[PDB]
Design a protein around this ligand. Structure first.
Ligand code: DAS
Ligand code: DAS
Ligand code: DAS
Ligand code: HG
Ligand code: HG
Ligand code: HG
Ligand code: NA
Ligand code: NA
Ligand code: NA
Ligand code: NA
Ligand code: NA
Ligand code: NA
Ligand code: NA
Ligand code: NA
Ligand code: NA
Lengths: 406, 406, 406
């Protein structure tokens, strides 16, 4: 029988029970609380390790497969769908957080473009560029944190060059095609340890909860994120699928249910990629030619739920700080949330790593992310589920939009 | 019709007009002055990004093509020509700057050798090694700045090993041959954006000029650099070509005019490399076998005008500081200027990145480079033009010196 | 005739004579003492440069050759032998140092596992992770020092994936097979300069000796390390070879004498790898299929003398500090010494780079390594000789244990 979904479901329920029991029956110091989540920490180390080779190989392989000029229309449709759906998600999140009200910008805007074109490839693999005004000259320095956005841009450009280069670049096509397969196999190996890591990751989160009052304080913020993700994944995505594809969207989701369930459990759109491939290709009978580009590329660029979560969380933290947001502040939040979703990886907690960028877009303190850390696991799992669902609908939508080409 | 040369010439003239008009009619603060050069800044980020893959692939591919022992004579002639002509340029620059007078060394000497053999390959991709006396033990630490010299040495050694390794290393030959072609294609893609970047780079430089008095103060220094570059490119280089090649050198230059013009506009010996290839192969009917090694390798090692500029500028800054230079100080300046030209990339402003090394050779402050920043663009464009011209003459000279081998 | 062994023997004796004469007849300041060892320093820079490509290619190539499931038994036998013999060495060293008595642990224990799975591949190439308690939250930061252990784990996992991936990963097999051959050729090129570097490395060590009193102070510690290494290489290793292989072990050592002699001279188990290959394959008629995996992999993981030296030196420094070691302290020293031997490279002085980890396991100051630096060269040469001998016996032992498979 299948072991992944079950093992992970058992891990999640065991994590809930372990967290509850340990938090109440026992009293652990900060030390023991940190040491109790060590297996989950090691899982994060392994997943963050696979980020860089996975992204580089996936982007290069995906865009190099679409070598033909006619095949490039498939890529054009995919990128416009990714941007359009992510923009819709950001708009929906901002509107909802403004309505419910649960609670140096140019430097960050230019830092987005600066990080889109890193000065060094090797440095971009593990470092990012940030500029700050001072006396008013601009001083920019590199800080830790993989430059996922710059790596993505170079990988897409490099893969396009390799595909157009023809047989001269066939060695590089094969090199990166094998490197993507090998990285996916390593992710599958990580899947063996994932259940235990997820157990101690979920349990570790519950232990850090102090007196259950923080969930009440963040309940309205949780409601805003959850309602936004729900609307996006149950109305907007099915609706757009119906307009482009004259087929039942909910049947499409039911055919891709195992992938969404796995995403909602492991909270990784890249680790669930094999499941996403299998579901779309087998149950939905989607063409392999468009899937092999839409799914792996969209697993990293197309992150709609993360974009919605970034927008809602940034506005909510601002509202907590009692900083009234103007039109330009809303616009800059929208752009940085779109960039943050693009620049965030498909790993658990990737949402929090790029959250500081959107927070600093409006001058908010970097450490203000701690205001929503406590309830991040539940929101992270859901935003990932919808993240994969966005790509899931894109596969069928791109297939319909490219029927003649295939 | 051709678009590059024209587009870039229009960009340069538009930059002059934009700079003049903006500097006089309008008054911009330091902030707006920095933000006005942002498109040029992004061009620098893209060009600096391509530095590392371009150099690594170019060196490995160039020296791996000359696999045969007989073919290794071609490489030997090329390297001796590069060193000899660069040494002549340094001597000419030092003599001129001493005559006109426009105005811890062992640690730097040993740091050259230390950086020739970096401790880490990945660190050398983005960091450099420097040692300083203190209490007198020596303390060495790594600092930011790509170790271009160490990467060059490893790439040459690695490429030699790959070429001699025969069919066992053929996969690596092909891998790096495709990687060089792909990097050149990415540079060609950058050429699309270059015109706008050059416009805002030239315009941005003029804005930073305060009251036009700095050009008068540096006029004699500009004259020394310009006369030195002129002499080197119109007397020494044509003369040596005549001794080795019994042909008209100025006709050779007229056949390679489009490459020199493009270099004088874009200020990059590596970005103009496709033009240099086309001119030498088509107009001058130079053999492709020797061109494919002399041009790409010489685009990074053989930088004669930069060597002349480094020597003249280092001595000129010293003269400004009223530090009387001894014989040993002149000798150490010559060696570090040769190393700096070798270690500087083929990008706009590469001359200034390695200038700190030669300045610190004589104990001068690192921030003293600011004394010649204002007039750097004009000198940078000319020194690049002669840089490409040095390689241009080397192609024909190496062909003549290897007539029997071909 | 052969030049390596002789040239290096002449270099060692010339280093002894140069060190003695320079130390006594002349009086050199700290400056001149440091500058006198510069050629040896450059040798260290070159060898440390080759560490990373050598290890990565060696591990991947070694474990990818054993693609077959039946062939994986060979790898299983090799790894269990490496661990078992290293554990025996650590136990022997601890017992001897406790008997003779020549003189935050959980954080280091968890740091071993954290570094086994680095967060970034590129960062692991040149940086390591360390955590420290403070106010008690845990704060972890990355520091300089190549993460050899994390690179080894990823390389082994990656190579296993590539081997199992079949013909899809054949391009990567060939890429890393050529990269290993090229790296070995570069090491052979370094062998040309090694004699001079070893001369100034040995001479430089003798100069730093102050008044010959430090050797007397560390004489008992030197005796403990030397007796432990002797016992391990003349009793334990020959005995275990006899149990598994019903052949004369000392004849096996006499057949591999040139490799042990070269190791005792150059103090590098990786630079002597070509000699180890030649001796085992020619004189001992060992099968090439098992040698090509046991030797290159064991040159980096299987370091028994280093493990013994790490344990003895850590306990000896602790004894100097008058810190009474409990059972748990001994156990944590044993584990960290095993990890340190695994994580240390096959270069001269690799023992000292990972010594700080085992020292900090028991809270000892990092700079306490200076207490045994003076006499490190002699101990380093011997521990390397036995390091290669451990792998030497493993080749024959693994061959006997896999007779049916071959
Ligand atoms: N959970 C990640 C991204 C995030 O957490 O924001 C994903 O797979 O989409
Ligand atoms: N301009 C660079 C080098 C420099 O600026 O010094 C070149 O292409 O030669
Ligand atoms: N000498 C190294 C390791 C060490 O010095 O500890 C070796 O080759 O084994
Ligand atoms: Hg949680
Ligand atoms: Hg200028
Ligand atoms: Hg010594
Ligand atoms: Na989207
Ligand atoms: Na996704
Ligand atoms: Na993303
Ligand atoms: Na030259
Ligand atoms: Na050049
Ligand atoms: Na150069
Ligand atoms: Na061992
Ligand atoms: Na070894
Ligand atoms: Na080791």
């Amino acid at each position: 029988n299948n072991w992944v979904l079950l093992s992970t479901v058992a891990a999640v329920v065991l994590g809930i029970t372990t967290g509850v029991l340990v938090r109440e029956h026992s009293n652990l110091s900060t030390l023991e609380k940190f040491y109790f989540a060590f297996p989950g920490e090691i899982l994060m180390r392994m997943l963050k390790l696979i980020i860089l080779p996975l992204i580089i190989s996936s982007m290069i392989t995906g865009v190099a497969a679409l070598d033909s000029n006619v095949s490039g229309k498939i890529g054009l449709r995919a990128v416009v769908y990714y941007f359009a759906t992510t923009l819709i998600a950001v708009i929906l999140g901002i509107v909802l957080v403004v309505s419910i009200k649960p609670g140096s910008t140019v430097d960050a805007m230019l830092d987005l473009i600066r990080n889109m074109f890193p000065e060094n490839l090797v440095q971009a693999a593990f470092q990012q560029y940030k500029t700050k005004r001072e006396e008013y000259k601009i001083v920019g320095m590199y800080s830790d944190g993989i430059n996922v956005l710059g790596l993505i841009v170079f990988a897409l450009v490099f893969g396009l060059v390799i595909g157009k280069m023809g047989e001269k670049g066939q060695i590089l096509v094969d090199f990166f095609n094998a490197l993507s397969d090998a990285t996916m196999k390593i992710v599958q190996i990580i899947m063996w340890y994932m259940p235990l890591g997820i157990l101690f990751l979920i349990a570790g989160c519950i232990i850090e909860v102090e007196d259950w009052e923080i969930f009440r304080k963040l309940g309205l913020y949780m409601a805003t994120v959850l309602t936004g993700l729900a609307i996006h994944s149950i109305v907007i995505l099915p609706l757009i699928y119906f307009i482009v594809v004259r087929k039942n969207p909910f049947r499409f989701a039911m055919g891709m249910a195992q992938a969404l369930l796995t995403a909602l459990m492991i909270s990784s759109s890249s680790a669930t990629l094999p499941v996403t491939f299998r579901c779309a290709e087998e149950n939905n009978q989607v063409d392999k030619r468009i899937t092999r580009f839409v799914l792996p590329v969209g697993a990293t660029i197309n992150m709609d739920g993360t974009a919605l979560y970034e927008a809602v969380a940034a506005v909510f933290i601002a509202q907590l700080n009692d900083l009234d947001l103007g039109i330009g502040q809303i616009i800059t939040i929208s752009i940085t949330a779109t960039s943050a979703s693009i620049g965030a990886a498909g790993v658990p907690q990737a949402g929090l790593v790029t959250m500081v960028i959107v927070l600093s877009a409006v001058g908010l303190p970097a450490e203000d992310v701690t205001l929503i850390i406590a309830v991040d696991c539940l929101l992270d799992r859901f935003r990932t589920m919808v993240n994969v669902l966005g790509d899931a609908f894109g596969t069928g939508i791109v297939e319909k939009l490219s029927k003649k080409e295939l």
